[PDB]
């Protein structure tokens, strides 16, 4: 058929990466709707996480497309529910988001390493081009948000969270 | 004439609901002008309540129109003056506004129940379509405002009320 | 707070309905990528199911929004993986899609019944307005597709599936 | 001069790759004109292969440009005539086209490997950027075409080839 230079080890890892991105999308959907609760009511934070839910879903879709293009076979698994039901303050959430992104980034790096070992340059380039750069930029932006939240919620935590939501997000 | 499947019990309750919406409109007019006092001076809060005064008056007008359309007879009663002359802080006012809206909502639910009991689907649909959805959305928005006011007026109440008025309303 | 006339029984059922719509979205994502396999290669069928994946996800999002608006609390569960890894012919898939939609429709009808029993007209109207009508139209369209697939794959099944994909989808 | 980190082994392989792409261009020109014969008369298939002849020629031209940019020296060899004079059915041709593309792809992978061994990242990136991705997409598209041709020419081969040409190409 069309499959060429596409190992079963890479195929399986791409399937696992699809699951991790859909899991992340689901986490962001839960973060977003938590900040839209009447008793939380931070619309800018809700909007930030809803946008990330969409981006992670797009990530998954491009991986699946790539899997089909190389002749691998997509296999879906159960998607685990997010690690929490309530996500605390904006500070707590942005910390949980950075931890999540770093674990996706690490999965991307692990797949790139596997691609290198297997001499699969198309895999390596596809990750380089569509995932690694974007993760780095996103992680930087979250770290920046995290620094600003912290400087704000030193004293007067309520006031600080409100101003962050209104003036940054 | 035109009257069909329109009970006297529904007619009377529609008249009472008109009175409650005009009463609410009047309450909002008083809230709005209180926040426009030189010694209160929160223009965004004034504008929010003036807009609600207009919406409640529109509500009353659509009920009256519907009463005429079904062949019932509008009857007006005295409109009671608002429960207060001065409305305290933005926090106090938004609490009084939520209590008001919930009491309108309850009146709408009571009328819907009566409509169901009387087998009056046109009544049920007219409420569904023009009132119940809008009340729910409004109550959510007020609850959100209330949460943000509270998080702001934890410490530094004056500063918090000013920032809410400037950045949310 | 804002919660009014919103039973715990309805809240829980809304949470379960969110899970069913996300489960359906996931099923459609798997149907879509299966038809994009190089060894299946029916782009119109892929596009039809990808669009349904998006619609079901939108469905879930509106339910969550509504849950927040009424003051209920969203709770997410694990999303079960689709019932199959490979979906056979266009005929087999469209049959599996109709069965899925009818099971969503039945869940919507069950929730509407519960809403009626609980005297929750806002719930009843929200379903009426955004879900019941759309499900009916979609089920009709799938039944139409199914009839046309069947008339085509009487004799010359390969030729029939190709023509359906090219001239209908 | 300008030559830096550009091995004679890479230079020679780039020259061989230029020859393979021009050879492929020539094969596609012959495929295209065969389908334009009065006794074959499949215009859409002719147009598909003529477009591929142009793409492969562009491929060769970019390699030559790159050779000049790195300071290597282009050397041309005789271009071998296509492996066949007549190419049979649309099915036979699309099979021969996939085999051709996979042999170009393999040559690209071999050059990338050599580039890696020689620590020549500019070479590796130039291939990544302009050739490897495009080959993968093209091979997927040909595999899709091949699947659709096969499902069509099950029964009624003449009818199937005509419909493919008219509705896909
Ligand atoms: Cl291979
Ligand atoms: Cl009557
Ligand atoms: Cl209640
Ligand atoms: Cl050198
Ligand atoms: Fe909102
Ligand atoms: Fe977006
Ligand atoms: Fe968007
Ligand atoms: Fe958006
Ligand atoms: Fe995006
Ligand atoms: Fe986006
Ligand atoms: Fe992006
Ligand atoms: Fe997008
Ligand atoms: Fe994008
Ligand atoms: Fe594709
Ligand atoms: Fe919880
Ligand atoms: Fe909860
Ligand atoms: Fe690389
Ligand atoms: Fe930045
Ligand atoms: Fe003014
Ligand atoms: Fe207005
Ligand atoms: Fe106005
Ligand atoms: Fe106005
Ligand atoms: Fe209005
Ligand atoms: Fe208005
Ligand atoms: Fe309105
Ligand atoms: Fe108006
Ligand atoms: Fe209006
Ligand atoms: Fe009239
Ligand atoms: Fe007074
Ligand atoms: Fe006074
Ligand atoms: Fe109803
Ligand atoms: Fe809101
Ligand atoms: Fe495609
Ligand atoms: Fe769409
Ligand atoms: Fe779309
Ligand atoms: Fe689309
Ligand atoms: Fe939609
Ligand atoms: Fe859509
Ligand atoms: Fe829709
Ligand atoms: Fe849409
Ligand atoms: Fe829509
Ligand atoms: Fe909202
Ligand atoms: Fe399977
Ligand atoms: Fe499979
Ligand atoms: Fe109803
Ligand atoms: Fe209704
Ligand atoms: Fe139709
Ligand atoms: Fe011609
Ligand atoms: Fe061209
Ligand atoms: Fe051209
Ligand atoms: Fe052209
Ligand atoms: Fe080109
Ligand atoms: Fe071109
Ligand atoms: Fe190109
Ligand atoms: Fe061109
Ligand atoms: Fe080009
Ligand atoms: Fe130059
Ligand atoms: Fe010959
Ligand atoms: Fe000949
Ligand atoms: Fe590389
Ligand atoms: Fe690279
Ligand atoms: Fe394709
Ligand atoms: O909201
Ligand atoms: O978005
Ligand atoms: O996106
Ligand atoms: O994206
Ligand atoms: O004012
Ligand atoms: O207004
Ligand atoms: O209005
Ligand atoms: O309105
Ligand atoms: O595709
Ligand atoms: O779409
Ligand atoms: O949609
Ligand atoms: O929709
Ligand atoms: O032609
Ligand atoms: O072309
Ligand atoms: O091209
Ligand atoms: O190209």
Swiss-Prot record, chains A, B, C, D:
It comes from the Eukaryota. CDD domains: Ferritin. Gene3D superfamilies: 1.20.1260.10. Residues 51-58 are annotated as: Catalytic site for iron oxidation. PROSITE patterns: FERRITIN_1, FERRITIN_2, FERRITIN_LIKE. Residues 4-153 form the Ferritin-like diiron domain. Fe cation binds at residues 51, 54-55, 58, 61. Keywords: Acetylation, Cytoplasm, Cytoplasmic vesicle, Iron, Iron storage, Lysosome, Metal-binding. It is found in: Cytoplasmic vesicle, Autophagosome; Cytoplasm; Autolysosome. GO terms for molecular function: ferric iron binding; ferrous iron binding; iron ion binding. GO terms for cellular component: autolysosome; autophagosome; cytoplasm; cytoplasmic vesicle; ferritin complex. The keyword Plastid does not apply. GO terms for biological process: intracellular iron ion homeostasis; iron ion transport. Its main location: cytoplasm. Pfam families: Ferritin (PF00210). The keyword Cell division does not apply. Oligomer of 24 subunits. There are two types of subunits: L (light) chain and H (heavy) chain. The major chain can be light or heavy, depending on the species and tissue type. The functional molecule forms a roughly spherical shell with a diameter of 12 nm and contains a central cavity into which the insoluble mineral iron core is deposited. Interacts with NCOA4. Stores iron in a soluble, non-toxic, readily available form. Important for iron homeostasis. Iron is taken up in the ferrous form and deposited as ferric hydroxides after oxidation. Also plays a role in delivery of iron to cells. Mediates iron uptake in capsule cells of the developing kidney. Delivery to lysosomes by the cargo receptor NCOA4 for autophagic degradation and release or iron. Belongs to the ferritin family. In horse spleen the light chain is the major chain. This is Ferritin light chain. It comes from Equus caballus. The gene is FTL.
């Amino acid at each position: 058929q069309i499959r060429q230079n596409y190992s079963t080890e890479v195929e399986a890892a791409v399937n696992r990466l699809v699951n991790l991105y859909l899991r992340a999308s689901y986490t962001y959907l839960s973060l977003g709707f938590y900040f839209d609760r009447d008793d939380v009511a931070l619309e800018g934070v809700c909007h930030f996480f809803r946008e990330l839910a969409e981006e992670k879903r797009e990530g998954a879709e491009r991986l699946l497309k790539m899997q089909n293009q190389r002749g691998g076979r997509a296999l879906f698994q159960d998607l685990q529910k997010p690690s929490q039901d309530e996500w605390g303050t904006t500070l707590d959430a942005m910390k949980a988001a950075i931890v999540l992104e770093k674990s996706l980034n690490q999965a991307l790096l692990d797949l790139h390493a596997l691609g290198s070992a297997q001499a699969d340059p198309h895999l390596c380039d596809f990750l380089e081009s569509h995932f690694l750069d974007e993760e780095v930029k996103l992680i930087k932006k979250m770290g920046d948000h995290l620094t600003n939240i912290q400087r704000l919620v030193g004293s007067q935590a309520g006031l600080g969270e409100y101003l962050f939501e209104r003036l940054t997000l």
